[PDB]
Symmetry: C2
Subunit: 161 residues, 2 copies
């Protein structure tokens, strides 16, 4: 565990929840190369709890609400959406590294998560590229730089610790 | 707080405006709902131009004062569309935008910060409703819960 404490409470009573599966960070494999890019791209979702059914999700919510052990985000595989579409041409753009999904691996059946957690979100060399590209294809998608910066699908820029 | 470093040197940044939480008015009633709906964005820095944003990023990167999220009024998108029918749904409370106020010109932010995202009575409602209109929109409950546009459920207490 080492983390969440809200997630911990949830798992150290896993019996109470049938549909339970695992927190994202655990059931995900990311190519060390662009690990940092994916990381910022993920954000808090690295601690999302994946459950099989919504009922178990509500059970957790109600559970935490009682014990007040904190707040969490649950991902019911039966409700979440993993659809997404690539954009023809981005691959030839300058600075273009690749799509999130293509830079991550998920245990066979849990293929959805990729689509869900990322979708068409992309990675690039630098901020300038991200900006310059978001301006072009008026991307409503997310773009993170190898440097660690990020641009929301809506245009919010985050970076530089 | 990295915002502090950014403001306590505000001179370095011309296009600067203000952090969200400051320049926003929310009807105390469903304050909690809006709150979870906002999330970290309550500390987003609103700048006029992108250049100023890049300046801050570069500024923070140097001083290592921490990370922030900047909202260039010249890049952000505040477009959004309501959904016919949701108003007559059960549990339905209202759209985020309608439950918040922004200093005239900064009308964008509402559309940006929220869009069509909605508020409802309870989780059951939210779920039940996301299933119906297969909402790709966000739904928060007066109780404080939330469902991402993609279906991520968040809730709890402290």
């Amino acid at each position: 565990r080492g983390f969440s404490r809200a997630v911990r409470a949830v798992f150290e009573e896993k019996e109470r929840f049938p549909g339970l599966v695992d927190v994202v960070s655990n059931l995900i494999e990311v190519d060390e190369k662009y690990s940092l890019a994916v990381s910022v791209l993920l954000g808090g979702t690295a601690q999302n709890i994946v459950v099989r059914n919504v009922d178990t999700a509500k059970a957790i919510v109600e559970f935490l609400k009682q014990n007040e052990a904190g707040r969490v985000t649950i991902l019911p595989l039966d409700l979440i959406d993993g659809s997404f579409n690539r954009i023809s041409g981005l691959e030839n753009e300058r600075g273009f590294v690749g799509y999130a999904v293509d830079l991550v691996k998920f245990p066979s059946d849990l293929e959805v998560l990729g689509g869900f957690l990322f979708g068409n979100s992309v990675v690039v060399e630098t901020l300038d590229d991200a900006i310059r590209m978001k301006k072009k294809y008026r991307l409503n998608t997310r773009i993170a730089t190898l440097d660690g910066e990020l641009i929301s699908g809506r245009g919010a820029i985050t970076g530089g610790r």
